[PDB]
Design a protein around this ligand. Structure first.
Ligand code: CUO
Ligand code: CUO
Ligand code: CUO
Lengths: 416, 416, 208
C-alpha cells in the first residue's frame, strides 16, 4: 500500500498531481464532517475550540509564542494531509518554498479557475480560496508584489537570511523563536491588508495557502532536525522544555468527534511529533535549503559565526499581536536607514503569550552600509503598525537591546 | 588604594574608624552625603531624570545589575574614605552560617570609646528623611544556618552553582538570586526595610552585604581568569551594557571615578576602582581550588528546576513543592525576589535553574519517574508578596524540568 | 469578670452608657489596627477582601442572598462589639428597634456633636458618622421622614408586618429570605439617595 506520501514543491507537481489536488480539495471543502475542511480550519483559530467547545472564554487553538509551536503546526498539516488522502489526493501537501524568490505566485494557488481538459467545465480553484462559514465572508488575499524576486544577489533572500539564522541555533528553544517569526512573514505577505486572510490569526486557517506554507515551514523544521542529526545531537530529543513536550496539544488530544484522526490523537504529545516519518507516513522529496545540502548548510553556518556581528534584540510581548514592526537605525547626527522588519501574527482571540528569550535580528549589514561602527552610538527607532495602517504606542514596549556578538579575538589557544 | 576585610576580622580600631566615619557620613548633607547617596539605589527615583516620570535607579533582573551595585559600593567606600575611614567597607559573609548577627551592626549603642560615651550606632541603622520614616528590620532566626553538610548552606549551594557557569548571563541569573536572600531576611515583612526595593538602600547592612556580593562577583571574574576566558567581556545584555549607569553619570554624584565608570562595561575591572579584598575566597576554597571543586560537581548528573522570572510587582516570596503523581508533595525549595513598584520591570532573558536533584532524591524519586500525569513534570507554584495576597500564577510560564549533561570541556590533562 | 455583655435598646441607654459608647467608638475610629474600625468596615464591603486581599477580581465580603447570610452578619456585629469592649465600652452594641415607630431618629446617632459635661469640649459624634479612607469621602445619610411613626393603627408597622411574616416560617431557609429583605429596608431608609451611605452595599459598613 502506498501509505508513505511524499510532499513535493508545488512547482514540481505534474498536471496529473495538480489535478488530483484540485479535485481532492474541492471534495475536502465540501466535507461537512469534523474531518472536513471547515472543521479542520477551526482547529487553528476561530471558532476557538481550545477551552471545551461548549465554553465561554474562547481563546484560539494553536501554540504560538511557545516552543510547542512547531509541534502543533506539524500535527495540523498532517491532519489536512490525511484529509486530502481520504479525498484521494495521490500526493502529500505540497510546500511553497517561499524562501526562494518568486517570479510570480504559484499558478496552482494563483489562478481563479481551473479549466480542466477532463470535461471542459470551468471551476473556481479550490486552491485559490475558501469561504468562512462562521463569518459570512470569503477569504481574501492582498500581497505585496515586493516579495517578488529581488535579491541583493542571487540566492540571498530575506527569508533565507532569516531562516538561516534560525538554522544556526543549536538549542531548539532559541531555534524556535527565530523559526516562528520567519514563519510569520508569509502570513503577513499573503494577507496584507485584508482583515480576512493569512494576515489575521483567526482567518489564516481558512486560506488554502496556509497548508502549503506550513508544509514548507514543517519542511524547514525537518531540515533543522536533520541538521541536528548531522550535528550529532539527537534530532528527535529536545533538550529544552522537556516537560512541555509531554503535554498533549488540543484539539488533537480531544480524540473525539472533534478529531477523527487516530494518528494525530496518539501523536498529540509533542515528543512524538518529532519523528515525523515513522509516526506520520509522510516525507519530503528533498530536505534541503536552497541549493545547499545538509552538510553543506552546516559548513555554511559555521562560516557565519566566524565573523563578528551586531544584532538587535526584541522582547516580544506579542500582546497586540497582529502588527508589523519596523525598526531603523538612526545616526546621532545624520540619517536613518531601515534596519529591517519582522511581523507578528496574532488575533485578539489568541491567548496571551510572551517569548522567554529575545529575538535577535542581524543589524550588521545595515550598519556596515552606514559605515556605523559597532561602538558608535546610534539610536534605534522602531514603530509597530497594525495590519491596518495605524500607529501603535511603542512606549510600553521595552527598548530593544543592541548586542554585539564578537568572535573572541581569533582564539589562538583553543584551536590551531 | 583600599582593602576590604570581613566584618569579623575588623579590629576595634578598624571598626572604630568605621563607626565614626558612618556617623560623619550621616551628617554629610551634601549630595555625596549618605542621605543623598541612598537615593541612588531607589526611592526617591531620580533615575531617568528628576522629572516626574521615574523608575528605580538600580538595575535589577538585568545583567547590568551586578555592575550597578558594584559601582554603588565604591561610591560609599569613597564616601567613607573622604570621611576618613581607614579601611574599605567590610562584607558580611552571609554564606557561612551565622551564629548571631554581627556585633558591629547589631549593637544599637556604640559604648566603647576612650570617652566611653554612649551613642547610637550609625551602623545599626539610619532613617529615611523623605519618608520621615525610620528603617526597621525584621529578621528570621532561620538565618542561623543549619544544613546537613553544615558547610553547604542554601546560600553556599546557590552561590557555588552560580560560580560554576562560564556564561556570565547564566552566572548573573543565579548570582542575583542568592543576593536577594539577604534583603528578604533582614527586611522581613517591614515595608521600610531591606526587603523593600526603595527603602532597602537606607539600611547600612546594605553596604555590608553588597560588599560581600561584590567580593564574590569579583572572585568569579578572577575564577574566569583562571578559566582563561576574558573576565571583562560579557556575551549578552549588550544593550544594557552600553547604557550609562545613572545617577552615576549625572553631576549629582560628585565622585569622578564613578562617572567615567558609569558604563557597566567598564565596571568589570574592579582594579580600576583601586579597591582590593583581603582575600578572594569562597568558603575556604581558593580560586584555584574552587575551579577544581566545581568540575567534580559536573561529574554528577543533576536535574534542575527552571524558573522563568517575569518579576513580581511587589517583593515576593515564591515557594516550590514537588508532588508525586499521587497526592504527596515535598518542599522543593524557595527563592526570593526583591522589587518595588518603582522597579521599572525587567524579565530574565533566560531560565533560572535551581537544583531539584537533592530534593527529588529525598523524594526517592529519580529523574526518570513521572511526577505528574499530563506532562511528566507539572508542579504547583506558590507566590506570595512580602505582604499582601498571592499573585496570579497564570501569567507565569510553565515549569521546566531540566536534565543536565555533565560534560563540559574538561580533560584531566593535556599532552606534553 | 463581666465578659457577658448586654445589648440594650439605644433609647434605654443611660447617659453613662451613652458616654462610654461615644468615647469607645471615637477611639475605635482611631484604631489603625486590623481590629480597628476602618479595617472592620472592610469586611462587609469595599475594599473587597473576599478573594485573597492581594487579588484581582474583588467581590464583596458578605453573604447576601444566602442562608449563610444571618450567620455572617451575626459574626460581624460581634466583631465590632469586641472592638468596642477593647475600647472600654461597658455595654454591648445597642440595637435600634426600627420595627417600632420612630418619633425621631435616635439622639445618639442623630445629633452632630456631643457636648459632654466631662470637660465641656464639643466633639462631633463618632456615632453620627465616620469617614471612608478608601474613597476620599464622608458617609452621608438621607432618610425618608415618612418612616416616622404612622401606623395604620398602633403597633402595626410595615416592618412589624414584614418581620412577623418572616417569623412565621418554620424552616430557616424560608425564614431567611423574608428575614433578609426586611433587613434591607433600613439600609434603604437611612441611606436614601446618597451614594455613600447605608444605601450602598460598599458604603454601608462605614456608617455607624
Ligand atoms: O501559524 Cu498559527 O499560523 Cu502559521
Ligand atoms: O539590590 Cu538593589 O539592592 Cu541588593
Ligand atoms: O447586610 Cu450586608 O448589610 Cu445589613
Amino acid at each position: 500500500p502506498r501509505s508513505r506520501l511524499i510532499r513535493k514543491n508545488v512547482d514540481r507537481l505534474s498536471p496529473e498531481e495538480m489535478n488530483e489536488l484540485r479535485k481532492a480539495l474541492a471534495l475536502l471543502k465540501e466535507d461537512k464532517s469534523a474531518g472536513g475542511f471547515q472543521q479542520l480550519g477551526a482547529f487553528h483559530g476561530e471558532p476557538k475550540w481550545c477551552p471545551s467547545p461548549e465554553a465561554s472564554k474562547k481563546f484560539a487553538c494553536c501554540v504560538h509564542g511557545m516552543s510547542v509551536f512547531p509541534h502543533w503546526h506539524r500535527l495540523l498539516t498532517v491532519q489536512s494531509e490525511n484529509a486530502l488522502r481520504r479525498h484521494g489526493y495521490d500526493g502529500a501537501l505540497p510546500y511553497w518554498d517561499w524562501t526562494s524568490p518568486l517570479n510570480h505566485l504559484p499558478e496552482l494557488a494563483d489562478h481563479e479557475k481551473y479549466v480542466d481538459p477532463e470535461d471542459g467545465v470551468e471551476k473556481h480553484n479550490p486552491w485559490f480560496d475558501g469561504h468562512i462559514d462562521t463569518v459570512d465572508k470569503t477569504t481574501t488575499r492582498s500581497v505585496q508584489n515586493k516579495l517578488f524576486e529581488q535579491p541583493e544577489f542571487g540566492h540571498y533572500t530575506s527569508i533565507a537570511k532569516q531562516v538561516l539564522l534560525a538554522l544556526e541555533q543549536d538549542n531548539f528553544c532559541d531555534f524556535e523563536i527565530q523559526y516562528e517569526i520567519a514563519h510569520n512573514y508569509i502570513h503577513a505577505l499573503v494577507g496584507g491588508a485584508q482583515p480576512y486572510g493569512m494576515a489575521s490569526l483567526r482567518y489564516t486557517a481558512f486560506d488554502p495557502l496556509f497548508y502549503l506554507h506550513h508544509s514548507n515551514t514543517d519542511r524547514i523544521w525537518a531540515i533543522w532536525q536533520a541538521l541536528q542529526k548531522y550535528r550529532g545531537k539527537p534530532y528527535n530529543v529536545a533538550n529544552c522544555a522537556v516537560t512541555s513536550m509531554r503535554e498533549p496539544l488540543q484539539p488533537f488530544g480531544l480524540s473525539a468527534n472533534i478529531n477523527t484522526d487516530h494518528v494525530t490523537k496518539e501523536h498529540s504529545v509533542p515528543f512524538n511529533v518529532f519523528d515525523y516519518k515513522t509516526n506520520f507516513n509522510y516525507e519530503y522529496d528533498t530536505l534541503e535549503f536552497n541549493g545547499l545540502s545538509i552538510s553543506q548548510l552546516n559548513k555554511k553556518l559555521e562560516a557565519i559565526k566566524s565573523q563578528d556581528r551586531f544584532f538587535a534584540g526584541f522582547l516580544l510581548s506579542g500582546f497586540k499581536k497582529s502588527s508589523l514592526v519596523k525598526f531603523n537605525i538612526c545616526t546621532d547626527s545624520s540619517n536613518c536607514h531601515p534596519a529591517g522588519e519582522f511581523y507578528l501574527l496574532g488575533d485578539e482571540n489568541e491567548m496571551p503569550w510572551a517569548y522567554d528569550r529575545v529575538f535577535k535580528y542581524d543589524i550588521t549589514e545595515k550598519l556596515h552600509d552606514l559605515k556605523l561602527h559597532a561602538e558608535d552610538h546610534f539610536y534605534i527607532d522602531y514603530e509597530v503598525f497594525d495590519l491596518k495602517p495605524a500607529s501603535l504606542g511603542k512606549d510600553l514596549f521595552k527598548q530593544p537591546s543592541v548586542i554585539h556578538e564578537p568572535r573572541i579575538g581569533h582564539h589562538e589557544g583553543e584551536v590551531y | 588604594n583600599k582593602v576590604r576585610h570581613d566584618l569579623s576580622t575588623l579590629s576595634e580600631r578598624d571598626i572604630g574608624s568605621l563607626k565614626y566615619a558612618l556617623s560623619s557620613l550621616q551628617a554629610d548633607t551634601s549630595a555625596d552625603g549618605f542621605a543623598a547617596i541612598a537615593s541612588f539605589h531607589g526611592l526617591p527615583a531620580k533615575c531617568n531624570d528628576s522629572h516626574n516620570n521615574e523608575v528605580a535607579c538600580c538595575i535589577h533582573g538585568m545583567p547590568t545589575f551586578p555592575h550597578w551595585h558594584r559601582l554603588y559600593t565604591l561610591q560609599f567606600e569613597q564616601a567613607l574614605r573622604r570621611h576618613g575611614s581607614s579601611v574599605a567597607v567590610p562584607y558580611w559573609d552571609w554564606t557561612k552560617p551565622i551564629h548571631n548577627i554581627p556585633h558591629l551592626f547589631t549593637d544599637k549603642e556604640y559604648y566603647d570609646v576612650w570617652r566611653n560615651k554612649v551613642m547610637p550606632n550609625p551602623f545599626a541603622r539610619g532613617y529615611v528623611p523623605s519618608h520621615d520614616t525610620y528603617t526597621v528590620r525584621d529578621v528570621q532566626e532561620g538565618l542561623f544556618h543549619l544544613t546537613s553538610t553544615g558547610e553547604h548552606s542554601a546560600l553556599l549551594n546557590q552561590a557555588l552553582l552560580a560560580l560554576e557557569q562560564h556564561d556570565y548571563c547564566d552566572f548573573a541569573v543565579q548570582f542575583e538570586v542568592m543576593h536577594n536572600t539577604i534583603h528578604y531576611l533582614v527586611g522581613g515583612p517591614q515595608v521600610y526595610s531591606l526587603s523593600s526595593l526603595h527603602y532597602a538602600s537606607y539600611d547600612p547592612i546594605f553596604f555590608i552585604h553588597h560588599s560581600f556580593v561584590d567580593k564574590v562577583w569579583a572572585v568569579w571574574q578572577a575564577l574566569q581568569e583562571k578559566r582563561g576566558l576574558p573576565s571583562d567581556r560579557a556575551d549578552c545584555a549588550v544593550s544594557l551594557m552600553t547604557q550609562n549607569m545613572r545617577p552615576f553619570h549625572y553631576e549629582i554624584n560628585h565622585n569622578q571615578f564613578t562617572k567615567k565608570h558609569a558604563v557597566p562595561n567598564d565596571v568589570f575591572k574592579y582594579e580600576l576602582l583601586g579597591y582590593r579584598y583581603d582575600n578572594l575566597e569562597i568558603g575556604g576554597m581558593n580560586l584555584h581550588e574552587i575551579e577544581k571543586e566545581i568540575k567534580d560537581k559536573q561529574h554528577h548528573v543533576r536535574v534542575f528546576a527552571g524558573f522563568l522570572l517575569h518579576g513580581i510587582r511587589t517583593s515576593a516570596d515564591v515557594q516550590f513543592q514537588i508532588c508525586k503523581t499521587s497526592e504527596d508533595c515535598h518542599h522543593g525549595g524557595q527563592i526570593f525576589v526583591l522589587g518595588g513598584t518603582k522597579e521599572m520591570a525587567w524579565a530574565y532573558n533566560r531560565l533560572f535553574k535551581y537544583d531539584i536533584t537533592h530534593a527529588l532524591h529525598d523524594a526517592h524519586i529519580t529523574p526518570e519517574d513521572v511526577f505528574h500525569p499530563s506532562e511528566p513534570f507539572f508542579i504547583k507554584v506558590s507566590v506570595t508578596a512580602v505582604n499582601g495576597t498571592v499573585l496570579p500564577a497564570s501569567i507565569l510560564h510553565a515549569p521546566t524540568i531540566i536534565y543536565e549533561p555533565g560534560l563540559d570541556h574538561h580533560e584531566d590533562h593535556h599532552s606534553s
